[PDB]
């Protein structure tokens, strides 16, 4: 009952971020592609379909972000409304908050696993034909067992990041009334943003052949997963 | 006097936000090593020219918002002050701000940026007076003149806008919501500057007023939030 309440309350806040953040990403997709069609190709037959076919690429970044941000909105609201303090006062641990986050990251990581194979390569096997080897945007997951810049390590880490960014927000959405409620999101929002600035500069920097994206792309995934666990098990004897 | 206290509180947080926004984008501008090249130090007064209409909105939302959350914005208008002569006290501290973003955008940011690009030798952005009577022989190079001559006018518009929704729908919000709004409306001003920049020549015909639409459309929101909602 108290787990179905936390899931139903975050899901209404997660589907409201996915509509606001979709228009924010549409306008960034509209600011750019005018500038490649105002002194480039003609914006008469493509400007409404080139916008709508780059959606499963931009949904790779807003499906982990809306569950991250939707749990900061929902858990941060119940801390200020004194619903989580009185939840511990009747007696039940923070494992209810973790068992409600991972039962909700499963709902997102099976949309972000349908989007990452045969819904993502489809919109690059259709967006690059209307303009008429080493591409790695139209190959599916089985035929991505080539050599030489086969970047499936960035298509797997977009599904593991749904689980390790749902573990980090249950101890980082503790609202302190003295700091405020937006000042308390700052160690969380900077930690998610630092994760995507490292993996983007390891996918492209590892695409030239400067450092292989198996050692260094899963070291960051395991440093951040081990950070998710010490933060969640901090209430014990000193170590 | 407290005409000199509204203005002293605002001016301190404009220059605190502007020093913050320049130091942030100076460590990002430490990109050009990818060892003691001070390219980012002589390009400081160009960064002050770029972040000044945004530090004006964010710094006056932060300075008037702390006058409202300490309840000293209603206790002076319950003892006197009209809402016009508290608006006139954030314009009296806007004239030294306008006389600084046009005094360094013509004397300092020309000669500082050019002497850095020459020191790093291992839109013809020169000046508002250098581009004046430069191009004769319509195009793009005149829009860089109009988007630079009343770039100081965009500072006084954003200080008026940061006051229009302090009397409006941000007087009883927390302080973090005002900062998030100040960043979000600094994104819209980027969008209106680079999407009304080209498109007012290539898919339409504003000759001069195409550079006005960034400032003219944020002036209409300011007089809609204190007049129609009053």
């Amino acid at each position: 009952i108290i787990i179905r309440y936390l899931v139903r309350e975050t899901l209404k806040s997660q589907l409201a971020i996915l509509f606001i953040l979709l228009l924010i990403f549409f306008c960034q997709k509209l600011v750019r592609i005018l500038g490649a069609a105002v002194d480039g190709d003609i914006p008469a037959n493509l400007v409404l379909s080139l916008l709508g076919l780059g959606v499963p690429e931009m949904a790779q970044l807003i499906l982990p972000l809306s569950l991250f941000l939707g749990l900061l909105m929902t858990l941060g609201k119940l801390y200020t409304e004194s619903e989580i303090t009185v939840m511990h006062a009747c007696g039940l641990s923070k494992a209810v908050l973790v068992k409600a986050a991972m039962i909700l990251a499963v709902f997102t990581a099976i949309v972000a696993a349908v989007n990452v194979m045969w819904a993502g390569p489809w919109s690059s096997r259709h967006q690059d034909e209307v303009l008429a080897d080493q591409m790695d945007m139209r190959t599916l997951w089985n035929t991505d067992t080539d050599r030489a810049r086969a970047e499936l390590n960035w298509r797997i880490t977009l599904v593991v990041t749904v689980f390790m960014m749902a573990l980090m927000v249950v101890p980082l959405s503790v609202v302190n009334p003295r700091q405020g409620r937006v000042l308390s999101m700052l160690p969380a929002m900077l930690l998610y943003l630092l994760f995507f600035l490292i993996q983007t500069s390891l996918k492209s920097n590892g695409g030239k052949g400067k450092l292989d994206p198996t050692l260094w792309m899963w070291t960051v995934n395991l440093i951040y997963l081990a950070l998710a666990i010490v933060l969640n098990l901090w209430d014990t004897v000193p170590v | 006097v407290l005409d000199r206290y509204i203005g002293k509180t605002i001016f301190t947080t404009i220059m605190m936000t502007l020093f913050m926004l320049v130091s942030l984008s100076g460590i990002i501008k430490f990109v050009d090593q990818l060892g003691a090249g001070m390219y980012t130090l002589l390009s400081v007064p160009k960064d002050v020219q770029i972040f000044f209409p945004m530090a004006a909105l964010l710094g006056a939302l932060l300075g008037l918002g702390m006058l409202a959350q300490r309840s000293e914005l209603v206790v002076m208008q319950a003892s006197g002050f009209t809402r016009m002569q508290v608006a006139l006290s954030v314009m009296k501290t806007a004239i030294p701000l306008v006389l600084l973003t046009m005094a360094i955008g013509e004397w300092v940011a020309p000669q500082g940026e050019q002497m850095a690009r020459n020191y790093r030798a291992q839109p013809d952005a020169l000046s508002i007076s250098g581009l004046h009577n430069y191009v004769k022989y319509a195009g793009r190079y005149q829009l860089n003149m109009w988007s630079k001559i009343f770039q100081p006018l965009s500072v006084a518009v954003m200080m008026l806008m940061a006051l229009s929704f302090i009397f409006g729908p941000l007087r009883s919000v927390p302080m973090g919501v005002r900062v998030v709004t100040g960043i979000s409306f600094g994104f819209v001003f980027y969008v209106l500057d680079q999407i009304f920049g080209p498109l007012t020549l290539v898919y339409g015909i504003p000759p001069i007023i195409g550079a006005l639409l960034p400032s003219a459309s944020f002036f209409l929101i300011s007089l809609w939030l204190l007049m129609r909602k009053s």
Binding site: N176, L190, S201, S204 | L24, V31
Partner: peptide, 24 residues
């Protein structure tokens, strides 16, 4: 707000500005 919570936001946002300057 603290001495260890403040010194995280200084250090963690210093590494974001370095990582923005890396991929530009």
């Amino acid at each position: 707000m603290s001495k260890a919570r403040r010194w995280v936001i200084i250090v963690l946002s210093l590494a974001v500005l370095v990582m923005i300057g890396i991929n530009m």
